[PDB]
């Protein structure tokens, strides 16, 4: 069906070619051995071929290859009708988006002025909502779509140094020692969580619970709905800088060079991972491996079940600020201005992002997917790299004040857009968010 409809209605008729003469099914079994790039050329051969190559189940699978899962349903009328395949257009859409990030003209970004003369300390990007956190004591909910400020969460009496968001629920951690739970739509504080005595430095939200790390050397697990404190994890002698929570175990990294694995329900420390010869600053956890980055220059990969160190990843030369772990592929941003990609299964350093177009200073943040790695730096640039080859592609953002104070503190990316928190310590750059759009016209 659908392919038959086309044949009856269009009536191509009379083809002296091998595939036009084959029974429909076998022609399709043949075209299935081709790759999207081929199918697209084949489709420009003739009307018979175009109708065939435009199957649908053929593309539904080619999409299940690039991990698409969702077909695209466009709308509206030329004559000789054509029954376009939603899966096929979904594929082309993505192909165009990738190309757009890669070499498509850079459309000037929406500028979102805010947090004047202050720092944007934490960033969240969920759907069409952007949430900026600042040491100016506030947070601002924005529309990635219009670039307008929807709300300003005023309430904290200290600077905000951490946040988390899960559609309409925002959480904040301030120097005032409390977390606050907000309603992103109405912008009203729903809870104020007391218990920490020192700065709420880091937090990780999982479903209805959020775990907070503080300078007071402890962590607390809170219920987002009933603003209560379910558990207190005490055992760290120095400040807790980073934390991860998957709902089962809580993993924490502290200035005491230690990484601790916990079972929150019974407030017990199941493991104390020892190895880092200096402050632990970054953490990633996938339910199986714990990964920690230290001021000691190394990155350790641990088995969460046994507490055993599986790999000690060496090569960076300074502080690893951020790391992202997906499918056992790790990407680390470092103050040494370098970025590395690792296979945490084998320990191999797959790529080091550097070269003539490398960062001129510390890497402040990064994002990646199956194709690219996006990196930001104090050099005022946000760069795009090829994950598979480790090669530099282009500078997505290049602050003119880059070499004299302009800085990109952090970034967040979705499939179609990039949100950059930008500013400076010396006023050469007004603090703002830059929103770049890579969506395609379809």
């Amino acid at each position: 069906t659908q392919v038959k409809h086309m044949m009856q209605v269009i009536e191509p008729q009379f083809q002296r070619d091998f595939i036009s003469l084959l029974p429909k099914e076998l022609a399709l079994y043949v075209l299935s051995f081709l790759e999207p790039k081929d199918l697209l050329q084949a489709a420009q051969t003739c009307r018979y071929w175009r109708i065939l190559a435009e199957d649908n189940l053929l593309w539904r699978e080619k999409c299940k290859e690039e991990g698409i899962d969702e077909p695209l349903h466009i709308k509206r009328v030329i004559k000789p009708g054509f029954i376009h395949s939603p899966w096929k257009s979904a594929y082309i859409r993505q192909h165009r988006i990738d190309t757009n990030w890669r070499r498509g003209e850079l459309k000037s970004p929406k500028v979102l002025k805010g947090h004047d003369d202050h720092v944007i300390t934490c960033l969240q990007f969920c759907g069409n909502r952007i949430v900026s956190g600042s040491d100016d004591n506030t947070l601002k909910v924005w529309s990635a779509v219009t670039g307008k400020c929807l709300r300003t969460l005023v309430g904290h009496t200290g600077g905000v140094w951490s946040s988390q968001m899960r559609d309409n629920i925002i959480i904040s951690g301030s120097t005032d020692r409390t977390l606050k739970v907000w309603n992103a739509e109405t912008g009203e504080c729903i809870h104020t969580l007391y218990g920490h005595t020192s700065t709420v430095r880091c937090m990780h939200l999982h479903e209805k619970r959020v775990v907070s790390g503080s300078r007071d050397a402890t962590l607390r697990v809170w219920d987002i709905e009933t603003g209560q404190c379910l558990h207190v994890l005490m055992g760290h002698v120095a400040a807790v800088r980073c934390v991860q929570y998957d709902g089962r175990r809580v993993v924490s990294g502290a200035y005491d060079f230690m990484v601790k694995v916990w079972d929150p329900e019974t407030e017990t420390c199941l493991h104390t991972l020892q190895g880092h010869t200096n402050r632990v600053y970054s953490l990633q956890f996938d339910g199986i491996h714990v990964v920690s980055g230290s001021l000691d220059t190394s990155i350790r990969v641990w088995d969460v079940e046994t507490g055993n160190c599986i790999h000690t990843l060496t090569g960076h030369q300074s502080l690893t600020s951020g790391m992202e772990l997906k499918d056992n592929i790790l990407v680390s941003g470092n103050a040494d201005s370098t970025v590395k990609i690792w296979d945490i299964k084998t320990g191999q350093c797959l790529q080091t992002l550097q070269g003539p177009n490398k960062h001129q200073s510390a890497v402040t943040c990064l994002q990646f997917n199956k194709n690219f790695v996006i990196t930001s730096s104090d050099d005022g640039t946000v760069k795009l790299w090829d994950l598979k080859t480790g090669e530099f592609i282009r500078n997505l953002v290049t602050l003119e004040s880059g070499g004299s104070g302009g800085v990109v503190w952090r970034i967040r990316a979705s499939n179609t857009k990039l949100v950059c928190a930008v500013g400076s310590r010396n006023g050469t750059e007004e603090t703002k968010l830059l929103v770049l759009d890579f969506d395609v016209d379809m």
């Binding site: 720092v119 700065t199 300078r215 300074s318 502080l319 503190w409």
Partner: peptide
């Protein structure tokens, strides 16, 4: 190491 943190 002048990547953000709050003082005391």
């Amino acid at each position: 190491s002048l990547i953000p943190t709050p003082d005391k």
